[PDB]
Short mmCIF file of C-alpha atoms and ligand atoms in Angstrom, two decimals:
data_model
loop_
_atom_site.label_atom_id
_atom_site.label_comp_id
_atom_site.label_asym_id
_atom_site.label_seq_id
_atom_site.Cartn_x
_atom_site.Cartn_y
_atom_site.Cartn_z
CA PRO A 5 -61.23 -21.57 231.12
CA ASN A 6 -59.98 -22.21 234.69
CA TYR A 7 -56.14 -22.22 234.73
CA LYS A 8 -54.30 -23.53 237.82
CA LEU A 9 -50.51 -23.26 237.77
CA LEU A 10 -48.56 -25.16 240.39
CA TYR A 11 -44.87 -24.59 241.16
CA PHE A 12 -42.45 -23.76 243.96
CA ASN A 13 -42.26 -20.23 245.32
CA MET A 14 -39.78 -19.06 242.75
CA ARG A 15 -39.59 -17.80 239.16
CA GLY A 16 -37.71 -20.92 238.00
CA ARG A 17 -39.36 -22.98 235.25
CA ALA A 18 -42.93 -21.61 235.83
CA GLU A 19 -42.02 -18.01 235.10
CA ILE A 20 -42.25 -18.34 231.28
CA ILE A 21 -45.88 -19.48 231.71
CA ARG A 22 -46.51 -16.54 234.11
CA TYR A 23 -45.17 -14.04 231.51
CA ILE A 24 -47.33 -15.46 228.75
CA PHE A 25 -50.42 -15.37 230.99
CA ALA A 26 -49.57 -11.76 231.90
CA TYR A 27 -48.88 -10.76 228.30
CA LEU A 28 -52.07 -12.32 226.97
CA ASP A 29 -54.12 -11.02 229.95
CA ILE A 30 -55.31 -14.50 230.88
CA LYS A 31 -56.44 -14.99 234.45
CA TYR A 32 -54.91 -17.94 236.32
CA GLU A 33 -54.37 -19.26 239.84
CA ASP A 34 -50.67 -19.00 240.77
CA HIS A 35 -50.32 -21.80 243.34
CA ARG A 36 -46.93 -21.93 245.14
CA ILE A 37 -45.67 -24.70 247.45
CA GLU A 38 -42.95 -24.93 250.03
CA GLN A 39 -40.20 -27.52 249.66
CA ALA A 40 -41.56 -29.47 252.66
CA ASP A 41 -45.06 -29.72 251.06
CA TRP A 42 -43.59 -31.38 247.88
CA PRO A 43 -43.17 -35.13 248.76
CA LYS A 44 -46.95 -35.44 249.57
CA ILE A 45 -47.82 -33.76 246.26
CA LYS A 46 -45.18 -35.37 243.96
CA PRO A 47 -46.89 -38.81 243.70
CA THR A 48 -50.22 -37.14 242.72
CA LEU A 49 -48.80 -35.68 239.47
CA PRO A 50 -48.51 -37.84 236.31
CA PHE A 51 -44.71 -37.30 235.87
CA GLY A 52 -43.87 -36.22 239.47
CA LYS A 53 -42.45 -32.83 238.42
CA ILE A 54 -43.53 -29.19 238.44
CA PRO A 55 -44.63 -26.95 236.97
CA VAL A 56 -47.99 -28.39 235.99
CA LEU A 57 -50.95 -26.52 234.62
CA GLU A 58 -54.44 -27.73 235.22
CA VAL A 59 -56.78 -26.73 232.38
CA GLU A 60 -60.47 -27.74 232.79
CA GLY A 61 -59.60 -30.75 235.02
CA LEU A 62 -56.75 -31.93 232.74
CA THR A 63 -53.18 -31.71 234.18
CA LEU A 64 -50.64 -30.53 231.61
CA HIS A 65 -46.91 -30.77 232.37
CA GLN A 66 -43.50 -29.57 231.03
CA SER A 67 -42.94 -25.84 231.34
CA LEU A 68 -41.99 -25.32 227.66
CA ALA A 69 -44.75 -27.61 226.29
CA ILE A 70 -47.24 -25.55 228.31
CA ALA A 71 -45.75 -22.17 227.27
CA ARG A 72 -45.84 -23.21 223.63
CA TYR A 73 -49.46 -24.34 224.02
CA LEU A 74 -50.51 -20.99 225.49
CA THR A 75 -48.82 -19.06 222.61
CA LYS A 76 -50.38 -21.14 219.80
CA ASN A 77 -52.14 -19.03 217.13
CA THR A 78 -50.56 -15.87 218.55
CA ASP A 79 -47.64 -13.88 217.17
CA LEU A 80 -45.71 -14.84 220.33
CA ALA A 81 -45.21 -18.32 218.81
CA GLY A 82 -43.59 -16.99 215.66
CA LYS A 83 -45.79 -16.01 212.72
CA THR A 84 -44.59 -18.76 210.35
CA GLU A 85 -43.48 -22.39 210.87
CA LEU A 86 -39.84 -21.40 210.08
CA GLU A 87 -40.05 -18.56 212.60
CA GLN A 88 -41.71 -20.88 215.14
CA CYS A 89 -38.70 -23.15 214.66
CA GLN A 90 -36.24 -20.36 215.41
CA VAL A 91 -38.27 -19.25 218.43
CA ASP A 92 -38.40 -22.84 219.78
CA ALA A 93 -34.67 -23.28 219.12
CA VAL A 94 -33.61 -20.14 221.00
CA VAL A 95 -35.79 -21.21 223.97
CA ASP A 96 -34.25 -24.68 223.89
CA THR A 97 -30.70 -23.22 223.70
CA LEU A 98 -31.43 -21.11 226.77
CA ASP A 99 -33.11 -23.99 228.62
CA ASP A 100 -30.18 -26.28 227.85
CA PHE A 101 -27.85 -23.83 229.49
CA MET A 102 -30.05 -23.27 232.57
CA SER A 103 -30.47 -27.04 232.89
CA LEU A 104 -26.65 -27.48 233.35
CA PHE A 105 -26.81 -25.82 236.78
CA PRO A 106 -26.74 -28.40 239.59
CA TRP A 107 -29.65 -26.73 241.44
CA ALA A 108 -30.38 -29.67 243.83
CA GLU A 109 -26.73 -30.59 244.47
CA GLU A 110 -26.20 -31.25 248.21
CA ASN A 111 -22.37 -31.11 248.18
CA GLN A 112 -22.15 -27.32 248.56
CA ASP A 113 -18.50 -27.28 247.53
CA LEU A 114 -19.15 -29.11 244.20
CA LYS A 115 -22.21 -27.03 243.41
CA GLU A 116 -20.02 -23.90 243.78
CA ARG A 117 -17.16 -25.08 241.43
CA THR A 118 -19.72 -26.17 238.80
CA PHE A 119 -21.75 -22.94 239.07
CA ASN A 120 -18.59 -20.82 238.84
CA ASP A 121 -17.48 -22.78 235.75
CA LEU A 122 -20.86 -22.33 234.10
CA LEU A 123 -20.97 -18.58 234.87
CA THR A 124 -17.30 -17.71 234.05
CA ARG A 125 -16.16 -20.18 231.32
CA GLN A 126 -19.27 -21.47 229.53
CA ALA A 127 -21.72 -18.54 229.70
CA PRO A 128 -19.56 -16.20 227.50
CA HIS A 129 -19.80 -18.80 224.68
CA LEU A 130 -23.59 -18.91 224.95
CA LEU A 131 -23.95 -15.13 225.36
CA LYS A 132 -21.71 -14.44 222.29
CA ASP A 133 -23.86 -16.79 220.20
CA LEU A 134 -27.15 -15.24 221.40
CA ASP A 135 -25.74 -11.79 220.69
CA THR A 136 -24.60 -12.77 217.18
CA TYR A 137 -28.06 -14.34 216.45
CA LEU A 138 -29.94 -11.27 217.75
CA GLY A 139 -27.60 -8.94 215.81
CA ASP A 140 -29.27 -5.63 215.10
CA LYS A 141 -32.82 -6.97 215.24
CA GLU A 142 -35.25 -5.39 217.68
CA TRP A 143 -36.22 -8.86 218.94
CA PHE A 144 -34.73 -12.32 218.49
CA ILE A 145 -37.01 -13.11 215.50
CA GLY A 146 -36.81 -9.62 213.91
CA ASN A 147 -39.49 -6.96 214.23
CA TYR A 148 -41.91 -8.50 216.85
CA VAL A 149 -41.71 -9.95 220.36
CA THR A 150 -41.83 -13.74 220.83
CA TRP A 151 -41.74 -15.98 223.88
CA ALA A 152 -38.00 -16.54 223.15
CA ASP A 153 -37.48 -12.89 224.19
CA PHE A 154 -39.51 -13.52 227.34
CA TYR A 155 -37.36 -16.53 228.05
CA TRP A 156 -34.17 -14.47 227.60
CA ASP A 157 -35.42 -11.92 230.14
CA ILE A 158 -36.32 -14.73 232.53
CA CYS A 159 -33.05 -16.67 232.16
CA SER A 160 -30.89 -13.55 232.24
CA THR A 161 -32.66 -12.36 235.41
CA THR A 162 -31.45 -15.47 237.27
CA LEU A 163 -28.01 -15.44 235.60
CA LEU A 164 -27.57 -11.81 236.80
CA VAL A 165 -28.53 -12.78 240.37
CA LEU A 166 -25.74 -15.39 240.22
CA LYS A 167 -23.19 -13.18 238.41
CA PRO A 168 -24.21 -9.46 238.40
CA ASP A 169 -21.40 -8.43 235.96
CA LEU A 170 -22.23 -11.19 233.34
CA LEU A 171 -23.55 -8.86 230.59
CA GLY A 172 -20.69 -6.34 230.63
CA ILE A 173 -19.89 -6.73 226.94
CA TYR A 174 -23.33 -7.60 225.49
CA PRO A 175 -25.15 -4.28 225.22
CA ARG A 176 -27.54 -5.80 222.64
CA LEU A 177 -28.65 -8.49 225.09
CA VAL A 178 -29.18 -5.87 227.79
CA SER A 179 -31.36 -3.80 225.35
CA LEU A 180 -33.40 -6.95 224.64
CA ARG A 181 -34.02 -7.49 228.40
CA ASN A 182 -35.04 -3.84 228.72
CA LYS A 183 -37.42 -4.06 225.74
CA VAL A 184 -39.14 -7.12 227.26
CA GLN A 185 -39.39 -5.48 230.70
CA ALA A 186 -40.96 -2.28 229.23
CA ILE A 187 -43.85 -4.22 227.66
CA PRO A 188 -46.67 -2.84 229.85
CA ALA A 189 -48.15 -6.26 230.82
CA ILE A 190 -44.68 -7.64 231.65
CA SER A 191 -43.66 -4.53 233.54
CA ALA A 192 -46.83 -4.81 235.69
CA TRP A 193 -46.10 -8.52 236.35
CA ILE A 194 -42.42 -7.84 237.29
CA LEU A 195 -43.52 -5.09 239.75
CA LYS A 196 -46.21 -7.36 241.19
CA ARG A 197 -44.53 -10.78 241.36
CA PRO A 198 -43.18 -12.32 244.58
CA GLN A 199 -39.53 -11.35 245.16
CA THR A 200 -37.56 -14.59 245.19
CA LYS A 201 -33.87 -15.25 244.56
CA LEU A 202 -34.57 -17.74 241.76
CA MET B 4 -33.21 -26.33 194.31
CA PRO B 5 -34.17 -26.03 198.02
CA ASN B 6 -32.94 -29.10 199.86
CA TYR B 7 -32.36 -30.31 203.40
CA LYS B 8 -28.92 -31.25 204.71
CA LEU B 9 -28.91 -32.75 208.20
CA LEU B 10 -25.53 -32.40 210.03
CA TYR B 11 -24.81 -34.71 212.98
CA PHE B 12 -22.31 -37.25 214.25
CA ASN B 13 -22.40 -40.84 212.98
CA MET B 14 -24.84 -41.78 215.74
CA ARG B 15 -28.58 -42.00 216.21
CA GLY B 16 -28.29 -39.59 219.14
CA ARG B 17 -30.19 -36.35 218.95
CA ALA B 18 -30.54 -36.47 215.13
CA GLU B 19 -32.51 -39.75 214.99
CA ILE B 20 -35.92 -38.11 215.72
CA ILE B 21 -35.36 -35.94 212.62
CA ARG B 22 -34.35 -38.99 210.54
CA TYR B 23 -37.53 -40.86 211.59
CA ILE B 24 -39.76 -37.93 210.64
CA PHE B 25 -38.04 -37.48 207.28
CA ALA B 26 -38.48 -41.20 206.60
CA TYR B 27 -42.13 -41.21 207.76
CA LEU B 28 -43.05 -38.11 205.65
CA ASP B 29 -40.85 -39.20 202.66
CA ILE B 30 -38.86 -35.97 202.82
CA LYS B 31 -35.57 -36.16 200.90
CA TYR B 32 -32.45 -35.06 202.77
CA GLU B 33 -28.71 -35.44 202.90
CA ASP B 34 -27.76 -37.36 206.05
CA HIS B 35 -24.36 -35.82 206.62
CA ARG B 36 -22.45 -37.65 209.31
CA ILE B 37 -19.40 -35.93 210.89
CA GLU B 38 -16.49 -37.93 212.23
CA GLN B 39 -15.56 -36.79 215.73
CA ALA B 40 -12.09 -35.64 214.63
CA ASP B 41 -13.56 -33.33 211.96
CA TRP B 42 -16.01 -31.73 214.34
CA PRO B 43 -13.75 -28.88 215.48
CA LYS B 44 -13.49 -27.73 211.78
CA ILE B 45 -17.28 -27.65 211.45
CA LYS B 46 -18.31 -26.21 214.93
CA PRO B 47 -17.24 -22.64 213.94
CA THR B 48 -19.56 -22.66 210.90
CA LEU B 49 -22.75 -23.23 212.92
CA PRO B 50 -24.46 -20.19 214.60
CA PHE B 51 -24.85 -21.96 217.99
CA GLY B 52 -21.85 -24.35 217.66
CA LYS B 53 -23.88 -27.55 218.21
CA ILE B 54 -25.46 -30.40 216.27
CA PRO B 55 -27.74 -31.47 214.92
CA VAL B 56 -28.49 -28.65 212.49
CA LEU B 57 -30.61 -28.63 209.33
CA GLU B 58 -29.15 -26.51 206.55
CA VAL B 59 -31.99 -25.20 204.30
CA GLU B 60 -32.17 -22.41 201.59
CA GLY B 61 -30.06 -19.73 203.38
CA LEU B 62 -30.82 -20.76 206.97
CA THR B 63 -29.25 -23.04 209.48
CA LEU B 64 -31.98 -24.46 211.74
CA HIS B 65 -30.80 -25.86 215.08
CA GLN B 66 -32.09 -27.80 218.14
CA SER B 67 -33.21 -31.37 217.49
CA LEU B 68 -36.68 -30.97 218.95
CA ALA B 69 -37.30 -27.50 217.40
CA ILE B 70 -36.46 -28.99 213.99
CA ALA B 71 -38.50 -32.16 214.68
CA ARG B 72 -41.50 -30.10 215.63
CA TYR B 73 -41.11 -27.89 212.50
CA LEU B 74 -41.15 -31.02 210.31
CA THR B 75 -44.41 -32.25 211.94
CA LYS B 76 -46.36 -28.95 211.58
CA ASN B 77 -49.83 -29.34 209.97
CA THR B 78 -49.36 -33.08 210.17
CA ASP B 79 -51.14 -35.65 212.42
CA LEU B 80 -47.65 -36.55 213.84
CA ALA B 81 -47.74 -33.24 215.77
CA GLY B 82 -51.04 -34.11 217.47
CA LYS B 83 -54.33 -33.04 215.85
CA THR B 84 -55.34 -30.33 218.35
CA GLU B 85 -53.42 -27.67 220.25
CA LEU B 86 -54.10 -29.64 223.47
CA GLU B 87 -52.84 -32.90 221.94
CA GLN B 88 -49.81 -31.08 220.54
CA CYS B 89 -49.06 -29.95 224.09
CA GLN B 90 -49.31 -33.55 225.37
CA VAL B 91 -47.06 -34.71 222.52
CA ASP B 92 -44.47 -32.02 223.25
CA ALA B 93 -44.58 -32.84 226.96
CA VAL B 94 -43.91 -36.56 226.52
CA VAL B 95 -41.03 -35.74 224.18
CA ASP B 96 -39.61 -33.26 226.73
CA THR B 97 -39.91 -35.82 229.57
CA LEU B 98 -37.91 -38.34 227.53
CA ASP B 99 -35.40 -35.71 226.46
CA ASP B 100 -34.97 -34.51 230.05
CA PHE B 101 -33.99 -38.02 231.13
CA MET B 102 -31.62 -38.80 228.20
CA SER B 103 -30.05 -35.38 228.97
CA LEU B 104 -29.09 -36.47 232.50
CA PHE B 105 -26.54 -38.93 231.13
CA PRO B 106 -22.99 -37.50 231.44
CA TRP B 107 -22.21 -38.60 227.85
CA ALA B 108 -18.97 -36.57 227.59
CA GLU B 109 -17.65 -37.12 231.15
CA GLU B 110 -13.88 -37.77 231.28
CA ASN B 111 -13.82 -39.42 234.76
CA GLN B 112 -14.85 -42.95 233.60
CA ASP B 113 -15.41 -43.94 237.21
CA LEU B 114 -17.88 -41.08 237.76
CA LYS B 115 -19.46 -41.64 234.34
CA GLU B 116 -20.12 -45.28 235.25
CA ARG B 117 -21.65 -44.56 238.68
CA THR B 118 -23.98 -41.93 237.17
CA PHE B 119 -25.02 -44.11 234.20
CA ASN B 120 -25.71 -47.06 236.58
CA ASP B 121 -27.65 -44.81 239.00
CA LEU B 122 -29.75 -43.39 236.10
CA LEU B 123 -30.45 -46.83 234.63
CA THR B 124 -31.12 -48.74 237.87
CA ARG B 125 -32.48 -46.07 240.28
CA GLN B 126 -34.06 -43.29 238.22
CA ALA B 127 -35.21 -45.08 235.04
CA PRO B 128 -37.81 -47.22 236.86
CA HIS B 129 -39.72 -44.06 237.90
CA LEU B 130 -39.76 -42.69 234.38
CA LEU B 131 -40.71 -46.05 232.85
CA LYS B 132 -43.53 -46.50 235.39
CA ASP B 133 -44.89 -43.02 234.60
CA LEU B 134 -44.66 -43.54 230.78
CA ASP B 135 -46.39 -46.92 231.11
CA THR B 136 -49.14 -45.41 233.32
CA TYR B 137 -49.54 -42.54 230.81
CA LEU B 138 -49.79 -44.89 227.79
CA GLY B 139 -52.14 -47.20 229.66
CA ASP B 140 -53.91 -49.46 227.22
CA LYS B 141 -53.96 -46.89 224.37
CA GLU B 142 -52.53 -47.91 221.00
CA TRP B 143 -50.18 -44.88 221.02
CA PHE B 144 -49.16 -42.24 223.62
CA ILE B 145 -51.86 -39.76 222.42
CA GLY B 146 -54.67 -42.25 221.70
CA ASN B 147 -55.55 -43.84 218.42
CA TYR B 148 -52.86 -42.34 216.12
CA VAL B 149 -49.06 -42.23 216.06
CA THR B 150 -47.25 -39.00 216.92
CA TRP B 151 -43.57 -38.08 217.09
CA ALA B 152 -43.68 -38.77 220.83
CA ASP B 153 -44.04 -42.49 219.98
CA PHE B 154 -41.12 -42.15 217.58
CA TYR B 155 -39.10 -40.48 220.35
CA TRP B 156 -39.87 -43.37 222.73
CA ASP B 157 -38.60 -45.85 220.14
CA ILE B 158 -35.41 -43.79 219.75
CA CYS B 159 -34.74 -43.20 223.46
CA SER B 160 -35.62 -46.79 224.37
CA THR B 161 -33.24 -48.12 221.71
CA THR B 162 -30.23 -46.41 223.36
CA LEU B 163 -31.47 -47.19 226.87
CA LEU B 164 -31.70 -50.89 225.83
CA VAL B 165 -28.13 -50.74 224.53
CA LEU B 166 -27.02 -49.46 227.96
CA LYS B 167 -29.28 -51.85 229.93
CA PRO B 168 -30.77 -54.70 227.86
CA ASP B 169 -33.19 -55.80 230.67
CA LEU B 170 -34.65 -52.28 231.28
CA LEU B 171 -38.09 -53.07 229.75
CA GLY B 172 -38.64 -56.61 231.04
CA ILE B 173 -41.50 -55.55 233.38
CA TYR B 174 -43.06 -52.98 230.90
CA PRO B 175 -44.60 -55.10 228.10
CA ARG B 176 -46.84 -52.21 226.98
CA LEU B 177 -43.71 -50.00 226.37
CA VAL B 178 -42.14 -52.86 224.38
CA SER B 179 -45.38 -53.20 222.44
CA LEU B 180 -45.25 -49.45 221.62
CA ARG B 181 -41.63 -49.75 220.34
CA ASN B 182 -42.77 -52.70 218.20
CA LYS B 183 -45.74 -50.83 216.75
CA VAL B 184 -43.53 -47.83 215.83
CA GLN B 185 -40.88 -50.10 214.31
CA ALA B 186 -43.66 -51.88 212.26
CA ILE B 187 -44.65 -48.65 210.47
CA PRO B 188 -43.41 -49.36 206.88
CA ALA B 189 -41.35 -46.15 206.41
CA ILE B 190 -39.79 -46.55 209.92
CA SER B 191 -39.08 -50.23 209.44
CA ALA B 192 -37.34 -49.52 206.09
CA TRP B 193 -35.31 -46.68 207.75
CA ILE B 194 -34.28 -48.90 210.70
CA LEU B 195 -33.25 -51.57 208.15
CA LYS B 196 -30.84 -49.24 206.32
CA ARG B 197 -29.53 -46.91 209.07
CA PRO B 198 -25.87 -47.33 210.02
CA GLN B 199 -25.36 -49.65 212.99
CA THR B 200 -24.01 -47.52 215.80
CA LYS B 201 -23.87 -47.92 219.59
CA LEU B 202 -25.64 -44.63 220.28
N1 LIG C 1 -38.16 -29.91 231.75
C1 LIG C 1 -39.13 -29.93 232.89
C2 LIG C 1 -38.39 -30.07 234.21
C3 LIG C 1 -39.29 -30.18 235.43
C4 LIG C 1 -38.52 -30.28 236.73
O1 LIG C 1 -37.60 -31.05 236.87
N2 LIG C 1 -38.93 -29.45 237.71
C5 LIG C 1 -38.32 -29.46 239.03
C6 LIG C 1 -38.40 -28.08 239.67
S1 LIG C 1 -37.53 -26.77 238.77
C7 LIG C 1 -38.99 -30.52 239.89
O2 LIG C 1 -40.08 -30.97 239.59
N3 LIG C 1 -38.31 -30.92 240.97
C8 LIG C 1 -38.87 -31.85 241.94
C9 LIG C 1 -38.48 -33.28 241.67
O3 LIG C 1 -37.71 -33.61 240.79
O4 LIG C 1 -39.06 -34.13 242.47
C10 LIG C 1 -39.98 -28.66 232.84
O5 LIG C 1 -39.35 -27.62 232.36
O6 LIG C 1 -41.15 -28.64 233.21
N1 LIG C 2 -30.66 -29.77 223.02
C1 LIG C 2 -29.71 -29.68 221.87
C2 LIG C 2 -28.35 -30.26 222.25
C3 LIG C 2 -27.29 -30.10 221.18
C4 LIG C 2 -25.96 -30.66 221.60
O1 LIG C 2 -25.41 -30.28 222.61
N2 LIG C 2 -25.44 -31.59 220.78
C5 LIG C 2 -24.13 -32.18 221.01
C6 LIG C 2 -24.06 -33.58 220.41
S1 LIG C 2 -25.33 -34.72 221.03
C7 LIG C 2 -23.02 -31.31 220.44
O2 LIG C 2 -23.24 -30.46 219.57
N3 LIG C 2 -21.80 -31.53 220.96
C8 LIG C 2 -20.59 -30.93 220.42
C9 LIG C 2 -20.21 -29.67 221.15
O3 LIG C 2 -20.83 -29.23 222.09
O4 LIG C 2 -19.16 -29.10 220.68
C10 LIG C 2 -30.31 -30.39 220.65
O5 LIG C 2 -31.20 -31.29 220.94
O6 LIG C 2 -29.99 -30.13 219.50
N1 LIG C 3 -34.02 -23.83 241.21
C1 LIG C 3 -34.11 -23.69 240.06
C2 LIG C 3 -34.21 -23.58 238.63
C3 LIG C 3 -34.15 -24.73 237.85
N2 LIG C 3 -34.23 -24.73 236.51
C4 LIG C 3 -34.38 -23.52 235.88
C5 LIG C 3 -34.47 -23.49 234.48
C6 LIG C 3 -34.63 -22.30 233.80
C7 LIG C 3 -34.70 -21.11 234.50
C8 LIG C 3 -34.61 -21.10 235.88
C9 LIG C 3 -34.45 -22.31 236.61
C10 LIG C 3 -34.36 -22.35 238.01
N1 LIG C 4 -23.08 -38.82 223.10
C1 LIG C 4 -24.22 -38.86 223.09
C2 LIG C 4 -25.67 -38.88 223.07
C3 LIG C 4 -26.34 -39.97 222.52
N2 LIG C 4 -27.67 -40.06 222.47
C4 LIG C 4 -28.41 -39.03 223.00
C5 LIG C 4 -29.82 -39.11 222.95
C6 LIG C 4 -30.60 -38.10 223.47
C7 LIG C 4 -30.00 -36.98 224.04
C8 LIG C 4 -28.63 -36.87 224.10
C9 LIG C 4 -27.80 -37.90 223.58
C10 LIG C 4 -26.40 -37.83 223.61
#
């Protein structure tokens, strides 16, 4: 099965797919485009957004729809429907938070006040809730890794670029990052991947 | 006895996808609707402090689309194949992305208005054109059977029509899809009895 991933040269919304491909040892083409390439490409995609994943000539879209697809019938999804629900919900909670950042905002001044608010006022509420949900479990769902844990590593990696001191009082969430990053396939991907800010 | 209690505001909003699925699958639930002024008493009781949630034997499930997808598992509503389930999820996410751009809770009523009007007059046409192109001449988004993506279009389009009643004038196939969803007997009976709210 030929897999062609297309995104910008960053971790961003494609990175969850990249982790899953790494974890499952599935070969794929990691196609990256420059900002100035994008207007020519945007009209050629069904919903004019990236990432997209081409699978056997079919173009799939929506980072989380694709990630979920790739984890189907694996433990990464959650082993039961109830667990799948919790896994999906943690991912969506994280994605909701990351989606508040005004990434394309041109007013640099406004972007900065909003970012600072997200990182200093709002993030502690989210982090507290993630910490309370993880509790003393090894992984978000309990005793096995899911793509929610991947997504926490991914989101926290960007959050830490933006605010390096953010996880001061959440040792459990730092342990979870560390557990994800020590998974041999993930560790090899992290070492290997292009070094981008986002 | 195990039962389902849905907690949300007295709105369609993000709970309505769950309500359609429950109606369609004939799943019994308590449709608990929170007045805005009571919300701050309830927020502390929910693990992630947001609604909707579904309270079930022990657990509190959260995230509208996580819950919706859970209720469709092993059901044709999900999509019949893994691939189709991906397409279903993706359409739902595209609609959710767009409804999520609206600054629903914005205090600055002048800003709120400019953003709503920009979304409805500038951005919406691109999304509608893409959804219409995706649907093409198919009976339903996925092909020949209804999925929760079609339900989610009915729901999103209902609120979008409240905000801009002429939004769908040039997209007859998207109107047709709303009509087909609304004509499903369990959906039609739910629409008939649901509380009349703006959102
Ligand atoms: N929820 C979607 C969001 C897709 C999205 O908006 N992607 C951005 C890049 S992070 C994009 O396509 N930007 C270009 C544009 O909007 O034209 C997903 O996760 O795939
Ligand atoms: N993506 C989440 C969003 C949940 C959300 O933010 N819900 C709003 C109401 S539409 C809420 O809980 N607002 C009250 C608050 O944040 O205190 C979902 O679909 O459940
Ligand atoms: N630029 C950018 C960007 C946009 N959305 C994201 C969502 C989740 C994680 C990282 C993200 C980065
Ligand atoms: N207030 C509000 C509100 C109403 N309807 C929604 C539909 C989809 C997503 C978010 C929504 C928020």
